[PDB]
């Protein structure tokens, strides 16, 4: 013997040094197990390894060829891996002969004389030859499980290739007659379709989810082929096992808790006048109006037209004033602040820049000096971070302008205490500004604070 399964490592170790004396594979001689079914029943796997390797070593040497070819040549396309699997195990007739010889002896259950007195249909009746074929195929299924677990490509294509190899060895054990697969499909179809009329309520409700009879039939066939067949025992029946597991899975599917409950709205409301459930779910999702938006846009257009008219501005002034700079957040915020009472700022950049030229003219003709210079050129890419600056904060707070501003914000105090939006605006001092000559603009902290406070007072 060479096989020993370690549950702690969840692996199966083969004594390759005893198999052929080559230690190149002994470095990674352990076969890994990931899927939970084999992680649950990785004992009959080793048992079948032993029971198929004890008879002679040309099967041992064949498994050696398998492992040596995967290890030396890990690279394998779908077609390449499939073809080499055919070459090394599937098309080795000696394996088929010896497995038949070792398996056909133990079969003792005889349904031939048991079914003589029984009554059963022609299509669903199972002969002993089919049972022997299924058991013989399942034995090679179990012995081949480790290597196809060693298949290293993607899990979707892992499942695809595993299912194809299984459906191929099923026909290979049957010499390509393509019969046992159809018999199993008929059994599954009959068992599933027996309850077409008994549970119409669920078969109707589940239609909301993407499920039906045929899809469930195909899914159950795939699951039966993939998982149930490995858990089989010699000197035992098959049909009863399949019926029990199919019925159990059907009940499990029927009784379940789905995450998202479904409730399709009816075709049409009965009243159809002044109220409707469809109308209600539409008014749940409605869009805004249009009149206020049109009025606001027209107000912006009139304002920009008046701005053009007053200062006889030409497009050359805009060309020499924009300098091609993009839009930064702080200038947009200030423009929104000052022109808030008349209207609101839209998203068109040309109108924003016209309003910014008006911004600069109107606040340069006044006593303000810092704000026009700040808004003239561009800003720094990043806003500087600064500490509390309580000293300057104390200066601004003790100023009568801060108290006067609070005298209008007194009714709402908790929100301001939580946010300190005035302090947020005051923290714009940290950010740098560069002129059209790239020279960093120097700003007086107290002067900036006083100008910002006056700006807030004159909103």
């Amino acid at each position: 013997n060479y096989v020993s399964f370690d549950e702690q490592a969840r692996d199966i170790n083969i004594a390759f040094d005893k198999l052929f004396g080559r230690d190149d594979i002994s470095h990674m001689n352990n076969f890994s197990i990931n899927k939970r079914s084999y992680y649950n029943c990785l004992d009959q796997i080793s048992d079948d390894l032993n029971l198929v390797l004890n008879k002679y070593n040309d099967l041992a040497y064949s498994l050696l060829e398998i492992r040596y070819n995967m290890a030396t040549k890990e690279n394998y396309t779908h077609m390449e891996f499939y073809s080499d699997i055919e070459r090394l195990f599937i098309k080795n007739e000696k394996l088929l002969n010896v497995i038949s010889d070792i398996v056909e002896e133990e079969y003792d259950l005889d349904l031939n004389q048991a079914s003589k007195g029984k009554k059963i249909n022609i299509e669903l009746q199972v002969t002993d030859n089919l049972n022997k074929i299924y058991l013989k195929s399942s034995v090679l299924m179990r012995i081949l499980i480790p290597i196809l677990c060693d298949f290293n490509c993607d899990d979707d294509i892992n499942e695809v290739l595993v299912y194809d190899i299984f459906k191929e060895v099923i026909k290979s054990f049957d010499d390509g007659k393509k019969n046992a697969l159809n018999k199993l499909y008929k059994i599954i179809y009959s068992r599933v379709f027996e309850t077409k009329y008994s549970d119409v309520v669920i078969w109707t409700y589940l239609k909301n989810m993407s499920t039906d009879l045929m899809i469930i039939v195909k899914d159950y066939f795939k699951v039966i082929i993939k998982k149930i067949f490995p858990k089989l025992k010699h000197n035992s029946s098959v049909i009863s096992y399949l019926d029990v597991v199919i019925k159990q899975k059907l009940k499990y599917l029927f009784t379940f808790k789905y995450p998202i409950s479904y409730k399709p709205l009816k075709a049409e409301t009965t009243d159809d006048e002044e109220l409707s459930e469809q109308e209600r779910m539409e008014i749940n999702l409605l869009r805004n109006d249009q009149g206020n938006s049109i009025i606001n846009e027209c107000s912006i257009k009139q304002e920009i037209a008046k701005i053009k008219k007053k200062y006889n501005v030409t497009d050359e002034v805009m060309k020499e004033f924009i300098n091609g700079r993009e839009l930064n957040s702080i200038q947009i915020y200030l423009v929104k602040i000052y022109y808030s009472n008349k209207f609101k700022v839209n998203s068109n950049k040309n109108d924003i820049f016209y309003l910014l030229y008006g911004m600069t003219r109107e606040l340069g003709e006044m006593n303000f000096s810092i704000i026009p210079e700040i808004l003239s050129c561009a800003i720094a890419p990043n806003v500087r971070k600064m500490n509390n600056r309580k000293k300057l904060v104390d200066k601004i707070i003790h100023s009568d302008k801060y108290s006067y501003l609070l005298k209008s914000y007194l009714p709402i105090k908790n929100i301001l205490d939580k946010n300190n939006v005035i302090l947020q605006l005051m923290t714009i001092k940290n950010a740098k500004f560069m002129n059209k000559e790239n020279k960093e603009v120097d700003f007086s902290t107290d002067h900036l604070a006083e100008e910002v406070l006056d700006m807030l007072l004159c909103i």
């Binding site: 779908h78 077609m79 499939y82 022609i122 299509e123 009746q125 002969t127 030859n129 089919l130 294509i157 695809v160 290739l161 194809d164 459906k167 191929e168 007659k177 393509k178 019969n179 046992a180 697969l181 159809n182 018999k183 499909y185 008929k186 239609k207 909301n208 993407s210 039906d212 045929m214 899809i215 195909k218 066939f221 995450p259 998202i260 409950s261 479904y262 409730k263 399709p264 709205l265 075709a267 049409e268 159809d272 779910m281 539409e282 749940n284 999702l285």
Partner: protein, 179 residues
């Protein structure tokens, strides 16, 4: 093509029992031919129906009762078999994901159920990758079932959005609400 299906069902009869698979089986697996009761060409499969459509027409076409239909199909022969099935936007079939304490509730129009069925079926046909002779009883019955759901989609859209008085044709085209 779903639009032409009702015409073809009249040009030749028994289309419902000619694109379906009903292969029987004995105990061992040898097929049992029960074609004595059925006609000469019945239960052939859709994938074989398209290949031999030209020859199949001549057997069961009446030249003294369906003369107009026979000439129509000869002219438009390319659009008999389609390849892609369209689907319009959800602006006309809304669905809300409103949530509640008892759990999330999803409500939609009825047409969405069938649209979610054709996608599921076709997604379950192309799994096969390796070159393998697929068993007929596993693939052929699904094709006939899919065509059944494709036909019902055309009936549902024409019997709920246009034909009815509350449908779009007689409410938002010839009449309308107005500001």
């Amino acid at each position: 093509n779903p639009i032409l299906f009702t015409i073809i069902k009249k040009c030749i009869p028994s289309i419902n029992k000619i694109i379906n698979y009903q292969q029987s089986i004995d105990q061992n697996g040898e097929n049992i031919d029960l074609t004595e009761e059925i006609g000469e060409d019945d239960y052939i499969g859709l994938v074989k129906f398209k290949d031999n459509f030209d020859d199949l027409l001549e057997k069961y076409t009446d030249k003294k009762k369906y003369q107009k239909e026979y000439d129509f199909l000869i002219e438009n022969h390319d659009k008999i078999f389609i390849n892609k099935l369209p689907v319009f936007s959800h602006k006309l079939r809304p669905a809300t994901l409103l949530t509640g304490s008892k759990g999330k509730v999803l409500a939609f129009d009825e047409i969405n159920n069938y649209y979610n069925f054709v996608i599921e079926y076709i997604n379950q046909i192309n799994e096969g990758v390796v070159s393998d002779d697929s068993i007929d009883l596993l693939l052929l019955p699904l094709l006939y079932n899919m065509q059944f759901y494709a036909n019902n989609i055309l009936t549902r859209i024409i019997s709920e959005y246009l034909r009815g008085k509350k449908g779009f044709l007689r409410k938002n085209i010839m009449g309308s609400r107005i500001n």
